[PDB]
Design an enzyme around this catalytic site. Structure first.
Site, short mmCIF file in Angstrom:
data_model
loop_
_atom_site.label_atom_id
_atom_site.label_comp_id
_atom_site.label_asym_id
_atom_site.label_seq_id
_atom_site.Cartn_x
_atom_site.Cartn_y
_atom_site.Cartn_z
N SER B 45 -6.30 32.17 -27.81
CA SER B 45 -7.27 32.65 -28.78
C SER B 45 -6.91 33.99 -29.40
CB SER B 45 -8.67 32.77 -28.19
OG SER B 45 -9.22 31.50 -27.95
N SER B 109 -15.01 34.12 -29.75
CA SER B 109 -13.87 33.19 -29.63
C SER B 109 -14.17 31.75 -30.00
CB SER B 109 -13.27 33.26 -28.20
OG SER B 109 -11.87 33.14 -28.26
N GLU B 145 -6.70 25.00 -33.18
CA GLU B 145 -7.32 24.77 -31.90
C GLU B 145 -7.39 23.26 -31.61
OE1 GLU B 145 -8.21 26.51 -29.25
OE2 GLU B 145 -7.80 28.53 -30.10
C1 LIG Z 1 -9.29 30.99 -26.52
O1 LIG Z 1 -8.33 31.41 -25.87
N1 LIG Z 1 -9.96 29.99 -26.17
C2 LIG Z 1 -11.23 29.72 -26.77
C3 LIG Z 1 -12.27 30.19 -25.79
N2 LIG Z 1 -12.22 31.67 -25.62
O2 LIG Z 1 -11.57 32.05 -24.52
S1 LIG Z 1 -11.12 33.48 -24.52
O3 LIG Z 1 -10.55 33.79 -25.99
O4 LIG Z 1 -10.16 33.82 -23.53
O5 LIG Z 1 -12.30 34.21 -24.18
C4 LIG Z 1 -12.13 29.35 -24.52
C5 LIG Z 1 -10.71 29.43 -23.95
C6 LIG Z 1 -9.64 29.18 -25.01
C7 LIG Z 1 -9.52 27.77 -25.45
O6 LIG Z 1 -9.08 27.54 -26.59
N3 LIG Z 1 -9.84 26.86 -24.54
O7 LIG Z 1 -9.54 25.58 -24.77
C8 LIG Z 1 -8.55 24.96 -23.94
C9 LIG Z 1 -7.17 24.94 -24.61
N4 LIG Z 1 -6.80 23.62 -25.17
#
Ligand SMILES: *C(=O)N1C[C@H](NOS(=O)(=O)O)CC[C@H]1C(=O)NOCCN
Ligand SMILES: *C(=O)N1C[C@H](NOS(=O)(=O)O)CC[C@H]1C(=O)NOCCN
Ligand code: NA
Ligand code: NA
Lengths: 275, 275
Positions: B45, B109, B145
């Site tokens: 993210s 996020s 994403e």
């Molecule tokens: C970002 O990394 N993301 C979106 C969300 N935020 O997490 S954080 O930015 O660390 O706080 C959840 C975790 C992650 C994801 O995209 N999760 O999805 C799984 C990857 N396919």
């Protein structure tokens, strides 16, 4: 008649690139309808209904108020998953009631809440056995949300037939499972569900009572969405009820079409039962 | 001196079962520190920072107010991902401002917000090129994403060196990238970030200003968490600033330890710079 409704549904499904499981059971009367029901469908978040049953039964039996609070550690609130709890409490490390946790888990499909409650209740095998001992065959509860997130195929170990789901919902509804108090609480929570508004509810009249629980999988690199599900109990205009469960599995369709399948099938059962 | 801080960090990392990338760049002064910086780390993210830069630049240049609204279709709000937007608007099909979408995307996020904005801006290759043309090498933006959620390895195509991240943050901070208006807005949004409170911010004094962006991966069936990241600009007690980026990659450690690594390394840089 039931047969003709059933043929309508099968004809509808003919050109949908997915394996769709349907079951309907009247609550007060003998209506019954099953389509592709002998397959095993991945439940995804639908099994938070089953978890909630085991949790509330454990609270009931052991005399623990739903207003009592668990300490939710930072580490219980994983960032790597759907979790309105985690967004509401980014620091974690606070005390939350069973009630708040259950509501977020069932009505808002919280993945962290789910696993907090599996741990409270004593693990997947405790819920699996609980459901089994209710007299409902053909439900397998094997994996937590964290376990499912590690590997694609793990979701298929949490499987059900659609007719086991509506048998379970009917038992629930006819208050054969819980205390009065815990029954009302879970029922309200299922009506207050905010997820999947265009699934079971999607084409029914505005204001129709649908006590339900959604579930959804990811999509893999071959374009397959393993699960797009909704299960619930719906109130007809004369106050009677039916249980319905739809599992759109292993679909090459896009998400709009997967939800529409659920909404149209439900609409077809609704129309037949109102008359 | 820088060397000794660096040796402290390397000694700290000795017994951590992960590949940890660190970079620090003073904003106003010449401080610079890099550890394991020649590897390519999955951004997760964190690349919503880069996206937000491309979006606001496009709004600036084309004279589009951030208060103008996109129509967010039901289908833009996928259930199968972290999304406070989707929980706030379960029905979707409404008009949302760029401002609201960016805030949810960066500060909370949101995965759906991210992909809505990739589509607005013209896709991953548009953001990739934009960042490149700023004069910052060693950042690859290849996958939305939704694309990353389909398959484990896809996350590694969205990669960075840690020193490219702090070079980029410094350019941002010294307002070399955006209009005044869009700069202030993104900066505020990064300070208002609520995710990862025990990462960069975790051991700094209460109230320290940390304008940042987190990222996190899932864990696979071998116990490996591909990414636990935090990147940002932190305000020292005399009003000066440093950019910092930490990537805890391919870790066999648990999430508490992965976050602690970020917090302790940041705390060590903070302590050295305050004196
Ligand atoms: C970002 O990394 N993301 C979106 C969300 N935020 O997490 S954080 O930015 O660390 O706080 C959840 C975790 C992650 C994801 O995209 N999760 O999805 C799984 C990857 N396919
Ligand atoms: C449940 O199926 N979940 C949790 C959440 N709610 O979705 S819904 O119940 O359909 O509304 C997001 C989708 C799904 C997940 O568990 N998603 O995670 C990816 C599976 N490893
Ligand atoms: Na799975
Ligand atoms: Na990936």
């Amino acid at each position: 008649g039931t047969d003709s409704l059933k043929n309508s549904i099968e004809k509808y499904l003919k050109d949908k690139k997915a394996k769709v499981g349907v079951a309907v059971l009247g609550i007060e009367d003998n209506f019954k309808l099953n389509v592709n029901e002998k397959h095993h469908y991945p439940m995804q978040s639908t099994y938070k209904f089953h978890l909630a049953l085991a949790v509330l039964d454990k609270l009931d039996k052991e005399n623990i108020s739903v207003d009592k609070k668990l300490f939710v550690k930072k580490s219980d609130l994983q960032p790597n998953t759907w979790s309105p709890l985690k967004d509401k409490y980014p620091n974690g490390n606070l005390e939350l009631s069973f009630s708040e946790i259950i509501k977020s888990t069932v009505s808002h499909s919280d993945n962290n809440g789910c696993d907090i409650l599996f741990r409270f209740v004593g693990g997947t095998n405790k819920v699996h056995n609980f459901i089994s001992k209710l007299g409902v065959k053909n439900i397998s509860i094997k994996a937590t949300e964290e376990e499912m997130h590690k590997a694609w195929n793990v979701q298929y170990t949490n499987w059900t037939t659609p007719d086991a789901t509506v048998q379970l919902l009917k038992k629930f509804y006819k208050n054969e499972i819980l205390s009065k108090n815990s029954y009302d609480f879970l029922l309200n929570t299922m009506i207050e569900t905010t997820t999947g508004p265009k699934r079971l509810k999607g084409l029914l009249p505005d204001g129709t009572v649908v006590a339900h629980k959604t579930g959804s999988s990811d999509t893999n690199n071959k374009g397959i969405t393993a699960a797009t599900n909704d299960i619930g109990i719906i109130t007809l205009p004369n106050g009677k009820h039916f249980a319905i469960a739809v599992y759109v599995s292993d679909s090459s369709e896009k998400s709009d079409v997967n939800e529409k399948i659920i909404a149209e099938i439900c609409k077809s059962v609704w129309d037949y039962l109102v008359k």
